[PDB]
Design a protein around this motif. Structure first.
Motif, short mmCIF file in Angstrom:
data_model
loop_
_atom_site.label_atom_id
_atom_site.label_comp_id
_atom_site.label_asym_id
_atom_site.label_seq_id
_atom_site.Cartn_x
_atom_site.Cartn_y
_atom_site.Cartn_z
N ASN B 536 0.80 -1.21 0.00
CA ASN B 536 0.00 0.00 0.00
C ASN B 536 0.84 1.28 0.00
O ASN B 536 0.61 2.19 -0.82
N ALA B 537 1.81 1.35 0.93
CA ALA B 537 2.70 2.52 1.09
C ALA B 537 3.89 2.50 0.12
O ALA B 537 4.69 3.44 0.07
N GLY B 538 3.99 1.41 -0.63
CA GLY B 538 5.07 1.23 -1.58
C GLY B 538 5.19 2.41 -2.51
O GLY B 538 4.18 2.96 -2.95
N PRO B 539 6.44 2.80 -2.83
CA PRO B 539 6.70 3.83 -3.82
C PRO B 539 6.27 3.39 -5.21
O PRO B 539 5.56 2.41 -5.36
N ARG B 540 6.69 4.13 -6.22
CA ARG B 540 6.43 3.79 -7.61
C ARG B 540 7.39 2.69 -8.09
O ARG B 540 8.23 2.21 -7.32
N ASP B 541 7.22 2.29 -9.35
CA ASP B 541 7.98 1.19 -9.94
C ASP B 541 8.53 1.51 -11.34
O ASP B 541 8.30 2.60 -11.87
N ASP B 542 9.26 0.56 -11.91
CA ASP B 542 9.79 0.66 -13.28
C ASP B 542 8.86 1.41 -14.23
O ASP B 542 9.30 2.33 -14.92
N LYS B 543 7.58 1.05 -14.20
CA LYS B 543 6.54 1.62 -15.05
C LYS B 543 6.17 3.07 -14.74
O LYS B 543 5.57 3.73 -15.58
N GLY B 544 6.50 3.55 -13.54
CA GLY B 544 6.10 4.89 -13.07
C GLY B 544 4.72 4.88 -12.43
O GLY B 544 4.09 5.91 -12.26
N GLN B 545 4.28 3.69 -12.05
CA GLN B 545 2.92 3.42 -11.62
C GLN B 545 2.80 3.64 -10.12
O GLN B 545 3.59 3.09 -9.36
N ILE B 546 1.80 4.40 -9.68
CA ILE B 546 1.70 4.77 -8.25
C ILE B 546 1.04 3.69 -7.40
O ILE B 546 0.34 2.81 -7.92
N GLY B 547 1.24 3.79 -6.08
CA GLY B 547 0.72 2.85 -5.09
C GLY B 547 -0.59 3.29 -4.45
O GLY B 547 -1.03 4.42 -4.60
N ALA B 548 -1.22 2.37 -3.72
CA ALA B 548 -2.56 2.59 -3.15
C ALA B 548 -2.72 3.88 -2.33
O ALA B 548 -3.77 4.51 -2.39
N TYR B 549 -1.67 4.24 -1.57
CA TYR B 549 -1.70 5.41 -0.67
C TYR B 549 -1.71 6.71 -1.43
O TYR B 549 -2.59 7.55 -1.23
N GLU B 550 -0.70 6.86 -2.29
CA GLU B 550 -0.58 8.02 -3.17
C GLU B 550 -1.86 8.24 -3.99
O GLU B 550 -2.41 9.33 -4.02
N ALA B 551 -2.36 7.17 -4.60
CA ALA B 551 -3.57 7.21 -5.43
C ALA B 551 -4.80 7.75 -4.72
O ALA B 551 -5.65 8.40 -5.32
N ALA B 552 -4.87 7.48 -3.42
CA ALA B 552 -6.06 7.79 -2.61
C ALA B 552 -6.07 9.22 -2.07
O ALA B 552 -7.12 9.78 -1.77
N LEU B 553 -4.89 9.80 -1.99
CA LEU B 553 -4.79 11.20 -1.66
C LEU B 553 -5.12 12.07 -2.86
O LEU B 553 -5.41 13.24 -2.69
N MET B 554 -5.07 11.51 -4.06
CA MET B 554 -5.00 12.32 -5.26
C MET B 554 -6.12 13.33 -5.49
O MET B 554 -5.83 14.49 -5.81
N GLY B 555 -7.38 12.98 -5.31
CA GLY B 555 -8.44 13.98 -5.58
C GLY B 555 -8.66 15.03 -4.50
O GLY B 555 -9.44 15.95 -4.68
N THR B 556 -7.96 14.89 -3.38
CA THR B 556 -8.40 15.48 -2.13
C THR B 556 -8.23 16.99 -2.11
O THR B 556 -7.17 17.50 -2.49
N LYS B 557 -9.26 17.70 -1.65
CA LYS B 557 -9.18 19.16 -1.46
C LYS B 557 -8.74 19.45 -0.04
O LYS B 557 -9.33 18.94 0.91
N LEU B 558 -7.70 20.26 0.09
CA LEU B 558 -7.21 20.71 1.42
C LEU B 558 -7.87 22.03 1.85
O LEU B 558 -7.48 23.12 1.40
N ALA B 559 -8.88 21.92 2.72
CA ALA B 559 -9.61 23.08 3.21
C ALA B 559 -8.64 24.09 3.79
O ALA B 559 -8.75 25.28 3.50
N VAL B 560 -7.72 23.61 4.63
CA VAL B 560 -6.58 24.39 5.11
C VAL B 560 -5.32 23.60 4.78
O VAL B 560 -5.23 22.42 5.15
N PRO B 561 -4.35 24.22 4.09
CA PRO B 561 -3.15 23.48 3.69
C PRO B 561 -2.12 23.35 4.82
O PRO B 561 -1.54 22.29 5.00
N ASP B 562 -1.91 24.44 5.55
CA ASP B 562 -1.06 24.44 6.74
C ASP B 562 -1.38 23.27 7.67
O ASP B 562 -0.48 22.64 8.19
#
Ligand code: NFU
Ligand code: SF4
Ligand code: F3S
Ligand SMILES: [Cl-]
Ligand SMILES: [Cl-]
Ligand SMILES: [Mg+2]
Lengths: 263, 583
Positions: B536-562
């Motif tokens: 899940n927490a694994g980095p990317r690979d030969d292909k440049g393909q992302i892991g479960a954790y990174e993928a799940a953060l992707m759409g997220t709106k940060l109401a407060v970024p700080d």
């Protein structure tokens, strides 16, 4: 006011933190809310990132020279300490910075006390215990993988109540609990003394509660309170539940030979 | 390189938020994300910040000792590693453990599942959704009324809430918040009223007291929790109910205690945990559309809890085994750990080496290699003692990148729960369906941080029942006069093949766990671990393909970024354990 406690995690499997919460008298709830101020603790604290670091800075600056540092885990030295990285910095710096201003240091578990499993041969990460790195502050080693839940809690409640460091042995272990060999207060001892042994698993011996010495029990070389205080509200302890002592509260038990050999 | 891999499109420009340390997880992580001008995550990066190297430490040790070392990979996920280790050894040598041993083991693993999930929800995850100070605003009389219309759990008196509230107040007003210090209270993403807040906080505390009990089942059979003891060939807790030395053994009084605990645990998950998720879920209903990542596409699980002993066939594993691809849930592919082209881990974007020019090449764990090589790339920011910003185009984690036939997968409760669902097993389908009905959400809501969190709760109840079930089977064994706990025919090492490969596997709380051991001259030759949080927490690979954790953060709106409360929610929903990930 409550004695502030800064709980650090270095290299570790988080197991002494898990052990601490298993405390029954006092409840970790009652420790947290009423006996101490558990002011930094990676595992359970609400705050993260900058908010988390800030909270630490706050309590050090504020309660300086009076706070206790509890350390679980140890510090890797190889690759300039970057086998363990807290807030972009090797754990080793974070340890030094926090403990320079501390009143005293508790080293929870075998990791912080001796090395434990990361430091077993050939110890690639060069994992090194607290007391070999911090040497200008008093260190209480409370070893075992993990320590006994109600030992951990009784050590803290003692220090608060009597406002003292408990009597330590040569290794810095509170004598109260690490003063006597498991084997010198073991219930199966009668059998050892009369040559009654488990020779192989589930033999008449095992089913009768016989001494596990021949199955590689290291209780006779090993100091802890497991045979007396026992584990998890005194429900059991390794030997009572059928398996020889691993020697897990003693330095180097991983490389002391096999667990199932008499040594 | 603004590039796009799996549905998602990744941009390394825009502001960069950093979260280090990531708290309320096991061990050490560092998350970095990029935001666009609009405060949406255009990039996410998952750096494991630790390593110890058991894969290395085990060379040349006794395979019988192995479980005790690997056990110390993790004290949160406790015993799931030992259990896999013994399975692996037993697998290699061909050892058959008796029925009572298979029962007890499964009870201990079920006990973990229950305990872990419960401690995780309240003490790690809850404070992402619960404003502790808000709770001080609450009316006790309503709080009670709410908690009572939510469930039959008896600890609900208004007096009990008033008093806990006054205690909490004095704590906060003391100016020594401890764990609550600089917490995210008042954040606009916190979204539940003060009554549901006080409620949760009470249950948080009740859980902290009660969790300590559940683990006594480990204590009885294993000797202690954390880090109970196991045995190659079965279990050490030998059974003797009725003959002379029964006091030195698992007897009728011990079994009574165990029985007594099981009932309490299922009662706590049934009446406290699962409901509070449904209450809490209802306020965060829109979090059903945040944090799917790979969950809607790709899932993996190895199965768990063999009913009959020594049958690790899917047919006999109570928890689902299988592999989904690209949202093709009609086609649930079976999983094969012997297959070398199947289950692999690349290091391409990780601080290990495989030798020169084989960095792009991926390895099955029987051939796998844990040799560390710490080096940052071109766009790195910092020094050797310091990290301002990690270079993800190169190597960026202490975690290896595991893949299944080259596909990045998501593992964990949600994964099993989805596979079991589409396998049409009503022991998972129905309770998932009834959860959706109460929250008035569709099938697809599962594909999210909320669904992922629901999946976990649903399992604690299921795991509770399974725990009782394997206790019930132990008991029918003894009623029928089978009290055996250990096969000792290959306990002596001179009895072993001169060399042997083996696979041990388990479905740990966080997901699919495997151990790939090789024995040679009575000693360990290989020993390789691919643990769930590695997937899940694994980095990317030969292909440049992302892991479960990174993928799940992707759409997220940060109401407060700080203050990245939003990121913590999603990350915590995967139940990260990094000791576990890095080993
Ligand atoms: N579940 C679980 Fe553990 Ni700290 C993980 N990842 C397991 O192997
Ligand atoms: S089981 Fe261990 S501690 Fe107990 S009597 Fe035997 S050798 Fe001594
Ligand atoms: S393993 Fe540890 S808990 Fe006691 S019996 Fe040995 S010292
Ligand atoms: Cl009080
Ligand atoms: Cl109690
Ligand atoms: Mg690995």
């Amino acid at each position: 006011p409550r004695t502030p406690v800064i709980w650090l995690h270095g290299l570790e499997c988080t197991c002494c933190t898990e052990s601490f919460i298993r405390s029954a008298h006092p409840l970790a709830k009652d420790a947290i809310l009423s006996l101490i101020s558990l002011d930094y603790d990676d595992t359970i604290m609400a705050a993260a990132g900058q908010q988390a670091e800030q909270a630490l800075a706050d309590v050090m600056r504020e309660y300086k020279g009076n706070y206790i540092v509890a350390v679980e885990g140890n510090a890797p030295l190889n690759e300039d300490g970057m086998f363990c990285i807290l807030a972009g910095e090797p754990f080793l710096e974070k340890l030094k910075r926090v403990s320079a201003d501390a009143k005293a240091i508790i080293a929870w578990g075998s990791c912080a006390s001796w090395g434990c499993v990361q430091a077993a041969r050939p110890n690639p990460t060069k994992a090194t215990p607290v007391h070999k790195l911090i040497t200008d502050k008093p260190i209480i080693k409370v070893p075992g993988c993990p320590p006994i839940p109600e030992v951990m809690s009784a050590v803290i409640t003692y220090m608060l109540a009597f406002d003292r460091i408990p009597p330590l042995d040569r290794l810095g272990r509170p004598k109260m609990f690490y003063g006597q060999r498991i084997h010198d207060k073991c219930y199966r001892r009668a059998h050892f003394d009369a040559g009654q042994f488990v020779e192989a698993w589930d033999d008449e011996g095992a089913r009768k509660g016989y001494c596990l010495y021949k199955m590689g029990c290291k209780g006779p070389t090993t100091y802890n309170a497991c045979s007396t205080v026992r584990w998890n509200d005194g429900v059991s302890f390794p030997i009572q539940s059928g398996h020889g002592c691993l020697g897990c509260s003693e330095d180097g038990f991983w490389d002391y030979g096999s667990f199932y050999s008499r040594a | 390189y603004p590039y796009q891999t799996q549905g998602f499109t990744l941009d390394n420009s825009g502001r960069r938020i950093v979260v280090d340390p990531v708290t309320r997880i096991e061990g050490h992580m560092r998350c970095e994300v990029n935001i666009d001008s609009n405060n949406v995550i255009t990039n996410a990066v998952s750096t494991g910040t630790m390593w110890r190297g058991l894969e290395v430490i085990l060379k040349g040790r006794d395979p019988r000792d192995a479980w005790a070392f690997v056990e110390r990979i993790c004290g949160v996920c406790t015993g799931t590693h030992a259990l896999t280790s013994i399975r692996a050894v037993e697998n290699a040598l061909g050892i058959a453990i008796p029925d009572n041993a298979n029962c007890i083991r499964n009870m201990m693993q079920a006990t973990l599942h229950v305990h872990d999930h419960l401690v995780h929800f309240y003490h790690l995850h809850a404070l992402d959704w619960v404003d502790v100070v808000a709770a001080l605003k609450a009316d006790p009389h309503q709080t009670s009324a709410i908690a009572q219309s939510l469930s039959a759990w008896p600890l609900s008196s208004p007096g009990y809430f008033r008093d806990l509230q006054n205690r909490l107040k004095r704590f906060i007003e003391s100016g020594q918040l401890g764990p609550f210090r600089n917490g995210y209270w008042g954040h606009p993403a916190m979204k539940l009223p003060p009554e549901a807040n006080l409620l949760a906080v009470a249950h948080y505390l009740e859980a902290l007291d009660f969790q300590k009990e559940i683990v006594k089942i480990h204590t009885v059979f294993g000797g202690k929790n954390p880090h109970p003891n196991w045995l190659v060939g079965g279990v050490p807790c030998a059974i003797n109910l009725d003959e002379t030395g029964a006091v030195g053994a698992v007897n009728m009084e011990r079994l009574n205690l165990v029985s007594s605990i099981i009932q309490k645990a299922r009662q706590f998950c049934e009446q406290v945990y699962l409901p509070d998720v449904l209450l809490i879920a209802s306020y965060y209903k829109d979090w059903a559309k945040i944090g799917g990542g790979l969950s809607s596409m790709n899932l993996l699980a190895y199965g768990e809890f063999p009913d009959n002993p020594n049958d690790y066939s899917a047919s006999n594993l109570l928890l689902p085994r299988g592999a989904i691809i690209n949202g093709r849930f009609d086609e649930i592919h079976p999983v094969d750990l012997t297959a070398p082209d199947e289950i692999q881990e690349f290091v391409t974007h990780s601080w290990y080496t495989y030798g020169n020019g084989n960095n792009d090449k991926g390895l099955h764990p029987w051939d796998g290699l844990t040799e560390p090589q710490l080096v940052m790339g071109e766009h790195y920011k910092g020094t050797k003692t310091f990290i301002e910003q990690v270079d993800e185009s190169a190597k960026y984690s202490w975690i290896k990148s595991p893949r299944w036939k080259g596909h990045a997968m998501e593992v964990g409760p949600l994964a099993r729960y989805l596979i079991g669902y589409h396998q049409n097993k009503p022991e998972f389908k129905e309770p998932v369906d009834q959860l959706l009905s109460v929250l008035k959400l569709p099938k697809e809501a599962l594909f999210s941080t909320l669904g992922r969190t629901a999946a976990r709760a649903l399992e604690s109840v299921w795991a509770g029942n399974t725990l009782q079930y394997f206790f019930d089977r132990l008991m029918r064994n003894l009623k029928s006069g089978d009290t055996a706990t250990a096969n000792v025919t290959l306990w002596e090492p001179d009895t072993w093949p001169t060399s042997a490969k083996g696979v041990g596997f388990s479905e740990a709380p966080r997901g699919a766990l495997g151990h790939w051991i090789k024995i040679a001259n009575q000693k360990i030759d290989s020993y390789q671990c691919v643990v769930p949080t590695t997937w899940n927490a694994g980095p990317r690979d030969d292909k440049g393909q992302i892991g479960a954790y990174e993928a799940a953060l992707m759409g997220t709106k940060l109401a407060v970024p700080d203050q990245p409360l939003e990121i913590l929610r999603t990350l915590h929903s995967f139940d990260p354990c990094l000791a576990c990930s890095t080993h």
